[PDB]
Amino acid sequence: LSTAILKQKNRPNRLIVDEAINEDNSVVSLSQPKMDELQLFRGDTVLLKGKKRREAVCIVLSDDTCSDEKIRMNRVVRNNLRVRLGDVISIQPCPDVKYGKRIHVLPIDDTVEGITGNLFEVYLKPYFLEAYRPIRKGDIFLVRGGMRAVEFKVVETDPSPYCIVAPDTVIHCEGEPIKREDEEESLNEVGYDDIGGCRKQLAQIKEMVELPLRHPALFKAIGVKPPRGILLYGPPGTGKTLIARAVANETGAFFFLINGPEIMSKLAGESESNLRKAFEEAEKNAPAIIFIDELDAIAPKREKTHGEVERRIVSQLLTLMDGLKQRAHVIVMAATNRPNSIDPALRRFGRFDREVDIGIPDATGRLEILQIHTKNMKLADDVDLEQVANETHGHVGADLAALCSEAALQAIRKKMDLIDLEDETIDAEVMNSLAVTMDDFRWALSQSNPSALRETVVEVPQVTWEDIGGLEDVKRELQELVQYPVEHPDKFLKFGMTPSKGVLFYGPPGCGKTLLAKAIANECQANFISIKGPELLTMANVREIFDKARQAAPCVLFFDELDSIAKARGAADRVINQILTEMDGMSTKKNVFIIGATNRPDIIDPAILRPGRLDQLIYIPLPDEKSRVAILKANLRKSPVAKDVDLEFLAKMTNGFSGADLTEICQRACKLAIRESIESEIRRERERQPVPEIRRDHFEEAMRFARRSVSDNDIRKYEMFAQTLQQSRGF
Amino acid sequence: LSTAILKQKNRPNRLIVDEAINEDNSVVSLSQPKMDELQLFRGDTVLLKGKKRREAVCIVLSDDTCSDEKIRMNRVVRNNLRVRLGDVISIQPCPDVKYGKRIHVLPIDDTVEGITGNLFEVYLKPYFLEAYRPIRKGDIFLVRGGMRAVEFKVVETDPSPYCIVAPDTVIHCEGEPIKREDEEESLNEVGYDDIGGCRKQLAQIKEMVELPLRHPALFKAIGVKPPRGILLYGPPGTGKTLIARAVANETGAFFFLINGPEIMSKLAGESESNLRKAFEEAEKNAPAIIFIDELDAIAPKREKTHGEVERRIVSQLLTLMDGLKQRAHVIVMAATNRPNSIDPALRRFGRFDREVDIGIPDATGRLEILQIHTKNMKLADDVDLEQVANETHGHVGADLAALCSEAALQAIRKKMDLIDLEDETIDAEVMNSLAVTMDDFRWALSQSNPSALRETVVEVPQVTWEDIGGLEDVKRELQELVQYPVEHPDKFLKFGMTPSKGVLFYGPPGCGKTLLAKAIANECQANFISIKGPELLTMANVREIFDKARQAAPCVLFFDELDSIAKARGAADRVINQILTEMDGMSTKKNVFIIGATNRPDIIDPAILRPGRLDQLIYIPLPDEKSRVAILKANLRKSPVAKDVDLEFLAKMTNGFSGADLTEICQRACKLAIRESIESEIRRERERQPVPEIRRDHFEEAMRFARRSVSDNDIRKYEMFAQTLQQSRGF
């Protein structure tokens, strides 16, 4: 699997956190059989490994009420490891823990507000009375005393980082008290759990970055060289910088961060000095990561660049990238939202040759993002994040963070009648009551302008075969053309046939060509890329479409509305010839399928049909009576149709209708039902100051206005091309 | 021959390595007749020359069990020469070897891990006890002693580089111990054996570079001046830098390396200083090579350049190139992947006038690359590198190195369930078991995006006359037009006729024009360049195509789908007029053949047909019955067709079918067989929870759906142009 690196090892050292019974900050309880397997004894000091490299040293005890697979700890231990209930930790024996020489501690500010008592005497001394509590640098623990308990932070240890607080150890609380904001900033460090919708890409990053650095011998043994340069790219706001901070906070390697604007804001000469210093300091620390965020800020195309300093930065960076000895254990990551603006010399072998695409999240990916962002918001109980994830079509992670911000602001606007902008301090009874409801999310949805609306979406469609009425033969052909070479490639090797990767749908308008392309991509669970003819004529970029379909294989590359390009024949001639050239180079990829659709088969370019490009000509015809019943059933699945409606009769009397004409009939019936329902409630309001389902009368009224969208002469010509389209090339 | 310089001289001094019997690190055994021919005696110290200029001094002995053509040595001697079993060395008498004054040695780190004993006393003294072992600087030898033997490196010799370790010689092991990584980096130096698919180009480089430098008198005697500038060019990743390191590590000349980005990363003034210093230091060392890697980094087109410093670098380089006295014995090599971005003044006589094209490797060349890269990988036994070489179509050497990396990573992913990313050290039982299987290579193939897919391939096609059915007369014409002027030029001089270098294939679509062009290029063993019409209309660059066909002569330059250009008549007018101009200038090359194909002969530009451009008009017609049998046989060669299938009957009932229509019939039959086979196995799985060959029923079902791709009126018009196409020019 591609995500095997992210899988939990499920070792016995892994344990699940539980709610403590009597265990204080410095002890943890386990089941006795667990120590028997782990050979742990009583009174042993143990080391806990958690999230974001956080550590803790505590005492392991025996619990007869502890589960085998779980560990016992209080909320303080759960806090110090950045772990939560239900999360997994690791445990290992901790030897060589010596008595503390001197521990430097300090309290949290908001705990010692208004308190003038001696912190050491009143709080620290009783808590450290012969208990032999093991502590580590950076730990936070709650100490009772006085009217209110105060938390303290271990800022320095003698020795570091583990020590035992003996009664002979010197405990001192001098120094500037620790602000809660300082600990709060460290509490909310980014981790791999703060990225949603990037599970596959996070697996790639771990293999490319964390594996060659933690286990360089694993690559020397298999006799391969790991990459030195990783280029994260994607649209703006998709979380490349967020992944940078996640790797910064959850890697064992030394991490150096370079900002593009930071480097180029410096004078001519301090930029190169800072670049050289970054790579030098990364080589001094053996396993290191250099992240160059906004790579295209410092390394644009040398052909398209005016200043001398910009060109000297790019050459300096190329030199430093080439100067990595491959024995230095330095990996250079970079992020960019304009991957094609980067100097081509920086994307070669040995320099940023591996690329990770942090693309647009899909509906489930962006539901995961929404849960991450709302995880600390005060949500109401009626808010359905699954729904919000479904309407947020063109949103990226930053668009969803902005959407949650706007929802919170709408919630505040509903409470401004209770607050004032000029209060010295806000009311206390409005904070606890302040919650974001699903209505605020609907409002924020109506006002959000996504930044990723105008760019190609590559995802499995939700259109299913059940959305299509009839075309059972075409469904069989499409399965045998798109699914068999992908699912049973050995069959195609047995008979020596190579599969054809192209299909042309043609026929009258509104008969289901677009639905068929999406439905076959959905059944095969293949990514779907749709490029309408108008999008091509308003566009170098055809090359990016085919490259995008190559990266996302198995893919169905749909070229819809080819008739729009054909009518434009100029720019349309270049577009078609580019597409033909790409389809010739595309034959290598055995799992990218190209589909074209046109309802003007008389003007299609004959070269499109050459054996090897789109030689499978499938004719989607105007639906017959049985298919019309099926179309009407398929369109009305989401509608409450009353049982007296005879779809058999509706399909009998609509003779030359398309699938889209039948959809328009159902649309009119819903419009009549909505009008009747709206009139009914206005009449009720009129008297005070119904229409649950679409009935047969609505379909009668809607159908006497039915207009047939394909002429009889049109049907004749389409039937003629059903026989003579393969002959269109030649004369 | 063009590769005569690479041929082994097969001198008596050449010997084949053998597995030692009793020979230790300082002795080598030979057959007694070999010394009789070589006049070598017993106890003589001898010098061994191996790969990458490595040397060794040892003692020659007499072996009655040694072959005449082979030499005896242990693994230590085999290691010190960078030679392997089956490889050839050279031998010569070594006189004037004096006693050592002081030899500075040091051990390898991993050999002395955990060992605190005295290296000299325990190891070095017993091994050097009166044995009079001859040693050289940089030698590595294994010395027994203690619980574990330790290897030592000779870092300095008094005198250098040969010395005799007398008992009176001072042996000392002080100094920082030698890391194995340091020796490992020197072990894996690049040599001419680390380049695959460039045998012809390596021969060119040796003649242009290593011959004028080793034997300048050989050029003064024949009265010619050797070139001073060699330009390696090719697509990115094709191994130009690799050849640079190979020449650096396997030439007797002083080698200076200049990096384009290195030079231009310096300040305005240190760049010119570094260039001048490089050429000065190359002239101080008499036979020298200056390699300027990434030439286009420092020397772009002065017309297309903005900075003043860039233009001063180009002028500085032109001055230095012109300043080579031709008596300095300095050769300047350069590499570039944009040979047309270089200043035209640098490709003139006396400056980079010789060019070597490190092009795309072909199937056998890239099999050689794959063997080089996997030679230290742990491959399984089922991996077929010949197959991988066949699917990797658009790959260059760097794409194949990346492909082997991805295969190794897939192998690791299959073993992550046994390893952990957080282990302090990896498991030992998973390394030895970790091997790359052919399944990992198929996966890496499915994910590889080659960088050389979108560029012209120049190679001999695999299409053979047996792939074509019928057209026996056309095959005779093509042989008499393409093969006779190449194979029997004296015949064409006898009769005073000059051959015509152009052919126009025309006729109905799908009748074999593309196959005929590839088949004649394959029979003549000529390079084949194909330029489809769409590729031209999406493109200065026509000039590069004809230049590329001129460099690769004997070549068949195929202009396929000329009908696509004709229908576009603009950009198409410029393309045709450019092609016509090139065909006029192309008549000089007597061994570049141009072929055009069109299935719209009614709109071909009449100037194409002028006597001297494409005046040979060959009409490929719609196949007759006998040819249809031949086409069906040719298409089904790779398919398991059952014997009851009557191809004679199939061809009888398909009357007006093209070659491509018959191929489509065979494709449908294979699709029906695949569907039946897939249904059969699903039925077997259905009952548990066949179709070995295509039978006559499949061809019956497939043929009732057969559609004829050429109309009867189309056939009439094509037959009319079979008589009146030469008349198309004039009115």
Ligand SMILES: Nc1ncnc2c1ncn2[C@@H]1O[C@H](COP(=O)(O)OP(=O)(O)OP(O)(O)=S)[C@@H](O)[C@H]1O
């Ligand atoms: N995949 C994601 N998961 C969770 N939060 C995300 C994700 N992507 C974006 N966000 C949020 O959006 C914010 C902005 O994302 P960034 O990390 O700046 O994206 P970006 O790749 O840097 O885009 P740029 O810098 O404009 S090219 C982050 O701080 C997160 O709060």
Ligand SMILES: Nc1ncnc2c1ncn2[C@@H]1O[C@H](COP(=O)(O)OP(=O)(O)OP(O)(O)=S)[C@@H](O)[C@H]1O
């Ligand atoms: N066979 C069908 N089954 C169900 N709904 C259909 C069918 N054909 C058309 N429709 C409906 O009519 C709409 C027309 O879209 P399609 O027919 O898939 O695209 P089309 O064939 O290119 O025709 P266009 O887009 O109007 S030119 C669909 O979105 C459906 O709502």
Ligand SMILES: Nc1ncnc2c1ncn2[C@@H]1O[C@H](COP(=O)(O)OP(=O)(O)OP(O)(O)=S)[C@@H](O)[C@H]1O
């Ligand atoms: N012909 C070849 N034989 C063997 N290995 C090769 C060959 N070509 C490339 N490689 C491998 O691929 C790597 C990349 O080759 P390079 O030397 O970078 O090619 P290149 O010509 O320098 O391309 P540039 O520098 O981007 S223009 C080499 O280090 C080898 O490991």
Ligand SMILES: Nc1ncnc2c1ncn2[C@@H]1O[C@H](COP(=O)(O)OP(=O)(O)OP(O)(O)=S)[C@@H](O)[C@H]1O
């Ligand atoms: N005479 C033939 N013998 C064998 N196979 C043939 C023959 N003619 C056509 N084919 C098959 O049909 C395919 C069509 O390719 P060609 O006929 O060589 O190209 P063409 O003549 O330019 O016609 P196109 O490419 O369809 S416009 C070939 O790749 C073969 O698979």
Ligand SMILES: [Mg+2]
């Ligand atoms: Mg950013």
Ligand SMILES: [Mg+2]
């Ligand atoms: Mg549509």
Ligand SMILES: [Mg+2]
């Ligand atoms: Mg290079």
Ligand SMILES: [Mg+2]
């Ligand atoms: Mg062809």
